[model samples]
Target: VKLKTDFDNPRWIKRHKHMFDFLDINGNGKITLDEIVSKASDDICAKLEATPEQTKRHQVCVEAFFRGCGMEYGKEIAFPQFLDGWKQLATSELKKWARNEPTLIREWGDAVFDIFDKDGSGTITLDEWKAYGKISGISPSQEDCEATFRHCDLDNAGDLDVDEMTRQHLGFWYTLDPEADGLYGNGVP
Candidate 1:
């Protein structure tokens, strides 16, 4: 779930847009179901020794994002799906990336958290996240923004508590370690 960041990850993929267009050989505005995003998900799971829990969430996150790509269950998601799906995972979905890596949490969590919790609400309500995404320039659709928040708000509590956010950031940062050994991946090294 924490595999990316607001300023980085697929969000900042302003560059990858050109890449997808280049990769779309058919000029049909879509990629094979197995070609682009699948490889990304595959690589993430492969690089990290995911625990069973993490493994399931990885697939879950991918599936959740894929659900909106205007594609059939076994079909090619559109390029927009590629951009949004790869980058647009609910904060909750990416939280799947969180591991027990405290340093990662300590180093990057606060900064990313700050990006999301604008106005200092101490929690990111769906509205705050929505506005943040738009201001950030890579806004997901309104429903997608809400969906991201819904995924983040595990309790359906209306808002994300500060601790919940911190933990999520920790997991995200854990995946970001330069020397990430994938120890807590709940998979295998």
Candidate 2:
């Protein structure tokens, strides 16, 4: 799939607002770098305990991610700023993907797969899904996680592979279907 460029579209606007609220973890009406770093339930460094070097790498990555989101270190991002940044970044990434070039979207998909595959088992099971849901504060309960997992597990295989997860991740952001499969697929509240 491709990234959507119409940030001004009503559906896109609403989705962006939902993302803004999710990223604005503290509900302060603004997003901060600290909030982004802290809400990263996928921080492999923290999960496995990292040395200074690994920790530094992860920290730097989070900072870069914040900047990518149209933010700066030690600064807060208002919704308007975020919307502009999202448009620029999304459009840029979409072009890169069209050219068969590397994109942050692919890299992030890998990172997300690693985080969800907590046991390093090469796949995500229901147990891991529940754990990630709780740690990430994404899915509210085990039932919610199970529902999402089943939605993504097209084969009813009781586990999700990397490709399956990647599609869901992409769908979560790029799909304008309004009926896609994902945590926010049904429409974010």
Candidate 3:
């Protein structure tokens, strides 16, 4: 099966919708820049003991992520808008041009990887992922964390390094495969 850009694909919609549901934070069906920054900062601050340098890095990463996702001036991202943004990204020729470069999608992936990588180890372990969920206010259960970590750890390395995390993040946005790695939350529907 090849990657699909059809936003109408039910499975595609479900995958992205699952992403949107968590990013919505308050279940308000809208994701604001502030919401994203707050969640990231809260987790980072606690994990890093509120160190100014680390805090600034996290802030920059989170904001870059928001902008890189094409929500730079949207103020708030609605579900349909989120899907549309992914559609544009999935179909953009720039993705092909920058195939080996550090593209925006890659930056987005790095940003997320950094956010959950509390120990600065460049790898996300199950415990760190669980702690991230708790501090970020998502509060996913132990079972959820285990399943998500298992699914996203592409090489079955028992942890997610940057490459695996990035691939999975990309999968969540651009893959049509129902069993694609990095399916978020409960994994593939």
- Report the lDDT tens digits of candidate 3 across residue range 70-153: 666348789888787767766652465246656555654455566556447667767877776666645457666777765664
TM-scores, all candidates, are 0.31, 0.77, 0.72
- Runs off by more than 4 Å, candidate 1: 1-109, 112-121, 154-157, 165-189
Instruction: List CA RMSD, all candidates.
Output: 17.0, 3.4, 3.7
Where model 3 places Cα greater than 4 Å from the true spot, the runs are 1-4, 43-51, 92-98, 108-121, 137-139, 152-157, 185-189
Q: TM-score of predicted model 1? A: 0.31
Q: 78-178 in candidate 2: lDDT tens per residue?
A: 99888888777667666766787655656554555555554365577678767766666666577777677657655455787766665565555554543
Local distance difference test, candidate 2: 0.64
**C-alpha root-mean-square deviation, candidate 2:** 3.4
**Candidate with better TM-score, 2 vs 3:** 2
Ranking of all predicted structures according to lDDT, beginning with the best and ending with the worst: 3, 2, 1
Candidate models: Cα lDDT each:
0.46, 0.64, 0.64
Candidate 1 structure quality by residue, lDDT tens digits, 41-67: 455444444455554554554444344
Which pairs of residues collide in candidate 2? Answer: none
Q: Give the TM-score (vs. native) of candidate 2.
A: 0.77
